[PDB]
C-alpha cells in the first residue's frame, strides 16, 4: 500500500488534464522509481508517454510495483477541485479503491474504485531526427491557432538558423517565421533540409494548456512523426509522437 504526496495540487490537475485530452482510459505504473503511463488515442495517431521520477514528490513511500486503472473523466473532475496552495495525497490500502486527499484549511477525501483496464505494450525506438528546435509555448500556441483559423493542416519547415511554419488554406495564407536571433527560439541545429505536415486537430489538442514561460523541444524530419516534449519540475517529462500526413 503506497503513499504519495505532491505540493501544488493545481499543477498535477493541469498535467493530468493535458494528458487525458486524447486518451479515455489509462493505466499508471507504480514502481520504486516513480509513476509511469503510456497509451494510444483511439484513432491510433498520437502516442503519450508520461514519466514522474520519485524525486519530484514531497513524499514517496512504495513497497513494491503494481498498476492502477482509473477512469480519466472521474479522476480529472476530482483533481479539478484542488486550489493552487493545496497539497495532494494519493494512497491505496489493501482495498480495491484509490483515495485522493486534498489538504489545506480542511481535509477532503474522495474514493474512486479501480477498474480493469487492459494493458497493451507499445514503444518506439530512437529515430534519426535531422532537425531539432526548442521554443516557447506561447508562440506555438498562437501559430496553431492561426493555422486553424485559416487552414486545416500545418507544415513545419526548418532551415539553417531559421524556423518557419505555414498554413495554406483554400484561398488564404499564413506565414510565421523565426530565427535564433529572435526571442521565440532558443537554438536550432539542422542536419539537412527538412519539411513535413501534420493535422491541426491533434496539434491544437496537445499544445493547448501550454504555459507562456515553458520551453518545448520539437524534433522532426522528412515525412516522419514529430516528437514534442517538455519537462515537469526539472525531472518529470511528457512526450507526444504525432504521425505525419499522406
Amino acid at each position: 500500500p503506497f503513499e504519495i504526496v505532491f505540493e501544488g495540487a493545481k499543477e498535477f490537475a493541469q498535467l493530468i488534464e493535458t494528458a487525458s485530452r486524447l486518451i479515455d482510459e489509462a493505466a499508471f505504473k507504480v514502481t520504486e522509481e516513480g509513476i509511469s503511463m503510456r497509451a494510444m488515442d483511439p484513432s491510433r495517431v498520437v502516442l503519450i508517454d508520461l514519466n514522474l521520477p520519485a524525486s519530484i514528490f514531497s513524499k514517496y513511500e512504495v513497497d513494491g510495483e503494481e498498476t492502477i486503472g482509473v477512469n480519466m473523466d472521474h479522476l480529472k473532475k476530482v483533481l479539478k477541485r484542488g486550489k493552487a496552495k493545496e497539497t495532494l495525497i494519493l494512497r491505496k490500502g489493501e482495498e480495491n479503491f484509490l483515495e485522493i486527499s486534498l489538504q489545506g484549511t480542511a481535509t477532503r477525501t474522495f474514493k474512486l474504485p479501480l477498474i480493469d483496464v487492459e494493458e497493451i505494450e507499445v514503444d518506439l525506438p530512437e529515430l534519426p531526427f535531422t532537425a531539432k528546435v526548442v521554443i516557447l509555448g506561447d508562440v506555438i500556441k498562437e501559430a496553431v491557432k492561426d493555422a486553424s483559423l485559416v487552414s486545416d493542416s500545418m507544415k513545419f519547415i526548418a532551415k539553417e538558423n531559421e524556423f518557419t511554419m505555414r498554413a495554406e488554406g483554400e484561398t488564404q495564407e499564413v506565414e510565421v517565421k523565426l530565427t535564433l536571433e529572435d526571442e521565440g527560439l532558443l537554438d536550432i541545429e539542422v542536419q539537412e533540409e527538412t519539411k513535413s505536415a501534420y493535422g491541426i486537430s491533434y496539434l491544437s489538442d496537445m499544445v493547448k494548456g501550454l504555459g507562456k514561460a515553458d520551453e518545448v523541444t520539437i524534433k522532426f524530419g522528412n515525412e516522419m512523426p514529430m516528437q514534442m516534449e517538455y519537462y515537469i519540475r526539472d525531472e518529470g517529462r511528457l512526450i507526444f509522437l504525432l504521425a505525419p500526413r499522406v
Partner: protein, 55 residues
C-alpha cells in the same frame, strides 16, 4: 462495462420504447461496442449503407 471492458464511452443512445410485440431488449455490450467504434443500428439490428446504383 465490466463484461466487455469498455469504459471510455461518453454517450450511448437508446429508444424511448420498443415497437415489437415481444419487447425483448438487445444486450448492452453490443451497444457499447457500437458506440466505441462509431456505428449505428437499424430496426432489425443491422448496420446499413445507402447509395445510388449504376450499371
Amino acid at each position: 462495462m465490466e463484461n466487455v471492458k469498455v469504459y471510455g464511452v461518453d454517450k450511448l443512445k437508446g429508444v424511448m420504447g420498443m415497437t415489437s410485440g415481444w419487447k425483448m431488449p438487445e444486450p448492452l455490450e453490443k451497444g457499447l461496442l457500437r458506440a466505441k467504434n462509431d456505428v449505428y443500428v437499424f430496426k432489425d439490428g443491422t448496420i446499413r449503407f445507402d447509395a445510388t446504383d449504376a450499371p
